[PDB]
Design a protein around this ligand. Structure first.
Ligand code: NXL
Length: 266
């Protein structure tokens, strides 16, 4: 296809692999590249963590209102929101907002503890029919991104299909789906990635990941146009060389190629 050819050229210049899965929920059309290959999730797992916490909240009402207090010394690196609010604590809802919208690592590890760990999140994902997602480790060790290593990975197809089920479909009850959507829509970290390829002003709920090694970074998004049906897009990169840098521009370019196949151009 046009899109496949553009994605192949992006891979050649990048020197590594670009996994793409896009779904136009209007027509059902798809764009795929390396759809079933594993890529590290990095911070992108936090969008699915939010869905797993919301799933627990159907059981335990008031869960989003529960205030979590924590020590300063227990926070991992890259915890800007949780560090700032240590004296006040944060509610489970606030922690999800920081985890999803700022990629706060301390928030993500606190919510992992709330839902009983990476295996528990993986079980929730299996319960929606996602057989690919696996979370094995906590922040920051989950970002090692070692080539061929299956820990803390998913596939582009499974990321996009699960994002569809959770943020557009019925895997969560409607109030929880709306909350997940609203958290993703207020992300602040994705402006150079999928969003860079989306027409101005359209709502985009996305979650980025940047492992910081092996050219490994990613973004997945649900795009809500004003005039046409939602589109779901997952873009994941990896590279065989430890020192290879990830590229926002490559991710944005891959998003552009997929969206052009759906006749969406910024
Ligand atoms: C997620 O991959 N991480 C936490 C934070 N994420 O921000 S990003 O998703 O906008 O890149 C920083 C990078 C990374 C990490 N080092 O844990």
């Amino acid at each position: 296809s046009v899109a496949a050819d553009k994605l192949a050229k992006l891979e050649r210049d990048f020197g590594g692999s670009i996994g793409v899965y896009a779904i136009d929920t209007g027509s059902g059309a798809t764009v795929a590249n390396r759809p079933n290959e594993r890529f590290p999730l990095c911070s992108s797992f936090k969008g699915f963590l939010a869905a797993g916490v919301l799933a627990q909240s159907q059981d335990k009402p008031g869960l989003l209102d529960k205030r979590i207090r924590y020590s300063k010394a227990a926070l991992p690196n890259w915890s800007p929101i949780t560090t700032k609010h240590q004296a006040s604590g944060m509610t489970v809802a606030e922690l999800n907002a920081a985890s999803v919208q700022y990629s706060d690592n301390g928030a993500a590890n606190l919510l992992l503890k709330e839902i009983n760990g990476p295996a528990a999140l993986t079980t929730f994902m299996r319960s929606i029919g996602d057989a690919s997602f696996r979370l094995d480790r906590l922040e920051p060790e989950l970002n090692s991104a070692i080539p061929r290593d299956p820990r803390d990975t998913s596939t582009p197809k499974a990321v996009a299909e699960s994002a569809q089920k959770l943020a557009l479909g019925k895997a969560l009850p409607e109030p929880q789906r709306q909350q997940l959507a609203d958290w993703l829509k207020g992300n602040t970290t994705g402006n150079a990635r999928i969003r860079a390829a989306v027409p101005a002003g359209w709502e985009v709920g996305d979650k980025t990941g940047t492992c910081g090694v092996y050219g490994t970074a990613n973004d997945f998004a649900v795009i809500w146009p004003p005039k046409r049906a939602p589109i779901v897009l997952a873009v994941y990169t990896k590279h065989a060389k430890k020192e290879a840098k990830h590229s926002d521009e490559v991710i944005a370019a891959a998003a552009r190629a997929a969206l052009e196949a759906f006749n969406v151009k910024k």
